[PDB]
């Protein structure tokens, strides 16, 4: 005969759920509303029509307002609804095509105004920030636009109320601010050999059918990915599950066996909390929780001779006990205010069979054993404090570990295989 | 020599990526902004402070407003801003514990004012709507609230601009509206045997190893799952890929064979364009596109002679010709305005090996031959009309098929397997 054997087989992870999130090209068109944006963050207004665009009033020692003026405007009086009052501002703008952003400042409730700047811009995009005791605002002309700094005590006290669709940018992206104010945000795009052959690679081999009954104590721990959306920080872009690797050792029958485990999830439900459009409001764009319509895969492999004998497998059964994976307490660190906390969430795992995947490369065959556990919802229910989203059943991705360093399920597994 | 063969083996879909997006408990807190909701849509308001809360003006012959008054307010006059004008509006109240919603009406720009209503309620919640030349409003008492209708003309011309955060609800869920007036939106929660055994099941068997070379012409088509968020209909909650099944037949070497295929994706990138928080803005909560860092799986199985002998497989090598999948034209059906259309995007597939996944249960085992294709982006790009987001590389999930009945890749596959 011929002494054919298994193919050289290496055990490890397998194909897994993987979702990559890409931040939006801009922080997003936010609404015209009153608030006090945090320091070291730029506000970028994009008004559509002339007139008042942005107002800043710390109500103690500084009142400022930017006004947009159409080209071909000489000295003329106009009533502008500035700070809630229809005040008379006289404007001048000799521009033929450019628009003109003009700053108007008064130092006291009873004080007068004054024209500053100006900013000759075609895209109609203004940009401001508060930083280290001053206010930095774009000014000048394209393509060599620059910035100017206006002194003011209690600079952080200034609120920024806008009256047109606007955006919020970090300071660290000041290059993007410069290229946005040279030319506005990306344009609206204004779109309109053959036959069959069989060859014997080895003559008649010799194989026997074995059945290995061995105790498996599979331990697995979850891992969570927490991607915070660029901006103020009150909104989290993604709170998702990520494949989690783990390695441990346990003794069975007097033999030390080293095992590796990889926990992943499938069929997870995407809950999304929408706490408001204000940049200061708490929002969760997408966070994943596992329910009855979800499975948890546990890719397991060790160094026991059974696994070396597991290449050609006929049947596999896994009598495994159930575990109650609970949800921990994760605190969302907002820039200000009380930190919301996600708490609770438990789910029972039950052995919904086992899979054996084999990916072939060259002539090696990477194998992977996958215990897939189906899920049952059970107490305690999860909920996030200071919010109306409560009494939902599942295990959110905030803290699937729940402090526990590993969830363990033990049992027996029977492997009817073919060996030499 | 005992005659041993494969266990009863069946093929089918492989374990495929899955997801489930659950709509939020409510349409979400939509900021206070001026807008004109379409017909048959309830507007719900939960003001934080007394005074003017919501105003609805058709600008021709109907003007309505709601005022929230604290308990224990005599027949007193206070200055309120209606349609931009300050006015000494008179209001009366006798409630001790509740808050009073008072409706105020007029029928001209200069016209006189009148009182209608009222609604003495604890939750500080009001609900309004327009329909078929009528203004529906929730009124009466809790937990036994009733509905009332106001006559008018040009009911479609009335706007509804709210100075406090407001929700929008579909008509069909008026039941949930009614209880939403019984009690406020869901509470904020104001929170604080052993051993080892091996046994031979069959005596020594007899096997050989065979290399089967066969033409494979795999035809797979994508499928797109489109979930539109509830409400007016100007936002889409999800544009994802779905496991796409297909069946066909083809002839090789004079033998006909039927085949089944199941396409899916992994590593997909989630782009989330945001057109603004206004209920009438075009918003894509999440749409999936495949890029350099994504793979596309194709689970294939037929009835040929080969796949009978693929249970115990020792090696698999696939040589396939690459294919280009273009991006089709998908149209968003907004109620009004101009339909944005997503189009473009070309992705080239390359066979990065094959996999054989077998899973076991109390029934016949399920096998699946998963051809995994890696991706390379190439022109033309993809973009959505009437939107800044443009000239991005990948294949959007809107219309991956591009109208073709199937994407076909044909080539050879060599299978070194074990047989009796």
From Swiss-Prot, chains A, B:
GO biological process, one term: permeabilization of host organelle membrane involved in viral entry into host cell
Effect listed in the UniProt record for changing residue 339 to Q: Slight loss of infectivity. No effect on the association with liposomes
Region (Spike head): 26-185
Documented effect of changing residue 107 to S: In strain: Isolate MMU-18006
GO CC annotations, alphabetized: host cell endoplasmic reticulum-Golgi intermediate compartment; host cell plasma membrane; host cell rough endoplasmic reticulum; host cytoskeleton; membrane; viral outer capsid
Keyword check for Disulfide bond: yes
Site, as annotated: Binding to sialic acid: 62, 151
Motif (YGL motif): 393-395
Keywords assigned by UniProt, alphabetized: Capsid protein, Coiled coil, Disulfide bond, Hemagglutinin, Host cell membrane, Host cytoplasm, Host cytoskeleton, Host endoplasmic reticulum, Host membrane, Host-virus interaction, Membrane, Outer capsid protein, Viral attachment to host cell, Viral penetration into host cytoplasm, Viral penetration via permeabilization of host membrane, Virion, Virus entry into host cell
Intervals of motif DGE motif: 253-255
Chain intervals for the UniProt region annotation (Hydrophobic): 334-354
Effect of residue 192 to H: Complete loss of trypsin activation of VP4, resulting in a blockage to viral entry
S-S bonds: 164-177, 263-325
Segments for region (Spike body and stalk (antigen domain)): 193-420
Note: In group A rotaviruses, VP4 defines the P serotype. Some rotavirus strains are neuraminidase-sensitive and require sialic acid to attach to the cell surface. Some rotavirus strains are integrin-dependent. Some rotavirus strains depend on ganglioside for their entry into the host cell. Hsp70 also seems to be involved in the entry of some strains.
UniProt similarity note: Belongs to the rotavirus VP4 family.
Name the record gives this protein: Outer capsid protein VP4
The species this protein was found in: Rotavirus A (strain RVA/Monkey/United States/RRV/1975/G3P5B[3])
Phylogenetic lineage: Viruses, Riboviria, Orthornavirae, Duplornaviricota, Resentoviricetes
Residues shown, of full length: 40 to 475 of 776
